[PDB]
Amino acid sequence: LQPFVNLLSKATYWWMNTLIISAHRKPIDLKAIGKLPIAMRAVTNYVCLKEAYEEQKKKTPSIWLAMYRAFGRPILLSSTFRYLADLLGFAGPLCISGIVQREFLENAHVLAVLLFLALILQRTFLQASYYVTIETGINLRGALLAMIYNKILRLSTSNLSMGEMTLGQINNLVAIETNQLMWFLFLCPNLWAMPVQIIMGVILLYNLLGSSALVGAAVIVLLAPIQYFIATKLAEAQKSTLDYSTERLKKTNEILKGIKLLKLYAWEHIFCKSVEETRMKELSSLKTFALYTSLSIFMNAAIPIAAVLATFVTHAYASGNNLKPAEAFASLSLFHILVTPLFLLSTVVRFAVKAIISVQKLNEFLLSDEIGEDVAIKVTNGYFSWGSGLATLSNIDIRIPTGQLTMIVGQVGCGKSSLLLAILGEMQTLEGKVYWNRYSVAYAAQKPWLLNATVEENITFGSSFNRQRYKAVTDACSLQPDIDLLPFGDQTEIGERGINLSGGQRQRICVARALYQNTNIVFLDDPFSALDIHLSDHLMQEGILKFLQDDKRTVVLVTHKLQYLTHADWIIAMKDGSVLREGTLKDIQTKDVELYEHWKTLMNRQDQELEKDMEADQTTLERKTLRRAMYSRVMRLRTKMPWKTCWWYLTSGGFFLLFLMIFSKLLKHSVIVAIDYWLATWTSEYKADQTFYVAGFSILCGAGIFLCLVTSLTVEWMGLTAAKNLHHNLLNKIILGPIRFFDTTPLGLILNRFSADTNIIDQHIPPTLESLTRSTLLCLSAIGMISYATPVFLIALAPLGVAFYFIQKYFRVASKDLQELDDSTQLPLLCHFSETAEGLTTIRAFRHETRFKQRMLELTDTNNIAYLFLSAANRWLEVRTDYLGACIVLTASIASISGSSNSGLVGLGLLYALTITNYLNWVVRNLADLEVQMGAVKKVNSFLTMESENYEGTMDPSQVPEHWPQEGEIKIHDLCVRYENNLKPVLKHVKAYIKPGQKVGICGRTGSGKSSLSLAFFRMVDIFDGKIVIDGIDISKLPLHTLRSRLSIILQDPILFSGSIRFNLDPECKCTDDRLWEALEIAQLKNMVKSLPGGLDATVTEGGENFSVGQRQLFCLARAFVRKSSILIMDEATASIDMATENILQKVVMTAFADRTVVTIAHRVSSIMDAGLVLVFSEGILVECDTGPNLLQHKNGLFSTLVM
Ligand SMILES: CCOc1cc(CC(=O)N[C@@H](CC(C)C)c2ccccc2N2CCCCC2)ccc1C(=O)O
Ligand SMILES: Nc1ncnc2c1ncn2[C@@H]1O[C@H](COP(=O)(O)OP(=O)(O)OP(=O)(O)O)[C@@H](O)[C@H]1O
Ligand SMILES: Nc1ncnc2c1ncn2[C@@H]1O[C@H](COP(=O)(O)OP(=O)(O)OP(=O)(O)O)[C@@H](O)[C@H]1O
Ligand SMILES: [Mg+2]
Ligand SMILES: [Mg+2]
């Protein structure tokens, strides 16, 4: 009995049962799920698929043949199960005909029991086929991901091969093409099962109804081309909507990062309107998409009705016999059977075409350019090239002594990085040989590569953690001062996803990773490129010379700092892809005196140039940015369906639309039941005159078609209205919020609310709601009609319904976990592939390909097990609801046979009992989908219920003059500034009198509250005591727009917004082009604008990447001059700016802004030694407020110490 119970457990998915039941007790996690079986692990499937692919390559290789030879037998098994289920599905109409007709097989109860058994077997076989094909598709996805990851690990990094689009193509293959191929393998048995089922259904219809059934067969067969055409139009409209949504999301992201500047300039509403224009275009495209969706729904619901109408009218007239209940309702059952394959065969064909495209892309990727197969390293007569045939490195003959520092020196473009990568084997070897006396190399690439992991996980890089070595490595690279600034320290997730670091910090972290590894050979490729003199010298003295010589490492150091050549044991001088001369410094000097003299001249010139420029500190400005970035730093609910969120979404389109949808759907399903009952009455008159019944049937069918159209239009109209209203409210609501909200909430969360939740509301919810309402109404009408035919069925409705409740309860939570789990596993795996595409040279130099292969296999196995268990929960639910439906069919059949009203009613009840089995599962599935989507609607509403700023001022706008800050007086009385309630005040008792047209310089130590004062000028920070009176008007008693739009501010990092230069200068477009040209000339920028095509309407890239940072700062100066505020705030504007551009900025401020009151937070204190009023801040307290010379003459003063 053990094999029998094992087979039953497999067939009913009983092994999921416990995992479902536990979902109420505790959330489902990866620990609750087991591991993948050996036959299901990605490694075994990868080996099978790779063996098949290599067999094909032996013989151009066929991916399709490899997939068939690897994962073909399970497809044949699932096809056998699908054919058995299709055959056992036609027992429905046959048993309906037999029962309605009323030796042994003639018995009606025998036929009812046989129909029950046939339904149970059919559903078991169908779910088995679904599970087998889904498992095979998941195995194929794992194998394909492993194959493409190995191909990635083999990829060549040359610019000819590894282009800028290669990483995007890899991401597309991992995230899209592999999933398209997996879904095609999911749906492939349909491709040869649906045609057979359709042909057999048409044959059964013909056997039932003569040639009259061929008319309905043709009409309903017309549904497949119509659905294919409608799906083509849907794809086109979806691409259009996706383009418009991408533009809208680009604009929204540009607003969100940079919202502080927009609020300071009071340009938030202009950018909101700019986003709303793109939103309106996207909404028009979405309207076309919804129109085609409603067409699809209407056709799916109306072609069957027209086919039934044509069939039965043609039978009433052409056929000489009366319509019989058995034939009529068996044919109705056959039509209902045929609807689904005809509607979904177009989907299967579309997936087949997309799979052909995906296999073409995958096969074109699997055929890509890939890398080829004392003294530690020696190159003899080496001729290397980057794949173009032209040798980049010609006649390379070098020697790298073991355990000695080797420095490669040459001008930019010599081929030093090329020499290192040719030694590592990353480029083609035309001639020569590289001898290693390969081996693992600690490689620090010229472009630093960071994993999306913590600082410690980047530095250790798959190596055992040693605290002494880790501390020594961190000290040598001077990483502790900037690690301490990180929120979590070593455990701070850095990289693309995590905290953004400066180029110098990333370079030092990669150098630390190179130093930490205990490999005898270290390759450093310009490690001082993004560092300053002090950090470079410390790394050279402690890391290269001390730490790397304690371990006796063979160090190869590509550098431009020739001053370090005195520390070199071996020197390799390059020029134009060839070595001029190699050897010790003394040997080079003796043999090649000219090269030594040239090196001396270069060292002297570099020292002379750096002597003046050493004043600027790169590391100080990196650490200040990193420190400023950190200034800001349920069981009952699990099963609670969000009915309030559902009601809010339904009423967000208006009560008329909701009423129209509900009324139209109720009327449509009433009419459908009416046509079924009319057929019942017509057949129960069984040649009489058919005119009355034909006329009534035609009228009912026409009304049903019209109501199908009405409901299809109405649900999509409601969805469009709700989406429009929700997004329109959301954008404006979040923009008006305080700056503290944007400082606290990450940009990722807000952008998710604007992209993913918006897409869910726009395109996912309307179809889910339509399907849920349709399935629920079909089930309710079926139950009502079965109970009307036989009231005793209601007795069995109490148990079965109760069962249904539990079946819908547990599933609705279990899947909710599994889906989430699936998502939590999709993000890492994809990221892994990206981390391997960029950083491939580092991985292959460290020789850590095996570790990354293992990590990829783990990630894909986790993703596959999550997806498999989600699908298994779906199969569990389908089996449960299918057995419920079989019980319903058996009960209805027995009740109808025992107590018969008439033959037509028996047939009608049997048909409805048979049909409810299809929709019971979809009621639960759509309810779960609706709950998931209402989660996103709840997120959007939560963002919509946030608190905004107080944009309405106390003062009467008539009281405020037209030119309010005309003079520029400022009076700060007992100012107490905090960034949020319950936090400590950041400014305490600041009192100052800024004379109109007086140049004020604000200075102090880091964290003293200088930027907080500039924010208090704009009321971007919470003032709770004291006041700021600007030109006689308290700014607290003022609208925020009037205050912020009449004051000019210049921040440190300049930000320009995508659009025209005229748009950047004034989005409001109040000024004239002559004024804009005058401002551009003032900012010493008119010639640059003239050089650009179009002048004032030259396109600015997002962030202003077209212009240099100095040009961006000059643009900010031009905007400030356009504003004509007479009060200009400059928050360390000259920082991160070239010295020449800094002098230009100072000249512009002195000349053009001579009249305006300039309040400058000096980046360099010496710049405000001659300022009229100097405000010195210490720890939030105004220590000194006097003239510059007055503070200078007072010895031992804070300003005097700052100046020195
Ligand atoms: C992850 C794969 O998920 C499945 C995968 C399958 C495999 C399958 O032959 N589908 C047939 C469905 C039946 C009605 C023919 C089909 C055919 C064409 C288009 C879509 C579909 N189906 C696609 C999935 C959702 C239901 C319509 C079954 C069921 C599921 C499921 O979600 O439970
Ligand atoms: N990945 C690559 N694929 C193809 N060609 C490349 C690649 N990297 C560099 N080259 C080319 O090979 C030549 C050698 O330049 P390379 O980058 O090796 O010099 P370098 O001395 O390291 O220069 P730099 O000081 O600018 O870093 C140049 O013509 C360069 O354009
Ligand atoms: N966004 C913020 N949220 C909360 N507190 C903040 C925020 N920004 C700054 N603070 C707090 O206010 C203090 C005042 O520093 P602030 O940035 O205002 O000016 P600062 O002294 O000129 O700074 P820095 O020299 O680093 O640019 C900070 O030390 C910090 O404690
Ligand atoms: Mg280089
Ligand atoms: Mg500051």
Side-chain angles (χ1 to χ4, degrees), residues 624 628 631 1006-1007 1009-1012 1014 1052 1131-1132 1161:
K624 285 186 70 177
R628 288 197 274 252
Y631 276 157
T1006 300
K1010 305 176 303 305
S1011 303
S1012 63
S1014 62
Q1052 175 182 354
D1131 182 14
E1132 302 182 350
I1161 308 173

Side-chain angles (χ1 to χ4, degrees), residues 771-790:
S771 298
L772 173 59
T773 47
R774 179 175 52 90
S775 304
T776 312
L777 287 172
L778 287 168
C779 294
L780 289 180
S781 59
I783 290 178
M785 290 309 296
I786 299 166
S787 306
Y788 173 76
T790 52

Side-chain angles (χ1 to χ4, degrees), residues 1 25 71 82 111 150 185 366 379 412 482 496 542 597 703 711 746 783 971 1167:
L1 190 63
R25 185 189 308 105
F71 316 100
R82 184 67 136 80
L111 288 166
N150 287 254
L185 204 141
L366 296 185
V379 183
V412 167
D482 47 305
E496 177 185 1
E542 306 299 327
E597 181 63 27
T711 59
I783 290 178
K971 315 178 197 306
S1167 300

Side-chain angles (χ1 to χ4, degrees), residues 82 130 133-134 183 186-187 190 194 340 344 347-348 867 871 874-875 878 922 925:
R82 184 67 136 80
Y130 292 168
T133 191
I134 290 168
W183 266 92
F186 287 176
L187 307 183
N190 305 267
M194 283 176 166
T340 312
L344 294 176
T347 302
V348 180
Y867 201 62
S871 303
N874 294 341
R875 301 284 71 75
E878 282 214 43
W922 288 120
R925 292 289 296 275

Side-chain angles (χ1 to χ4, degrees), residues 110-121:
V110 171
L111 288 166
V113 178
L114 290 183
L115 176 55
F116 173 77
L117 299 181
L119 285 182
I120 279 192
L121 294 177

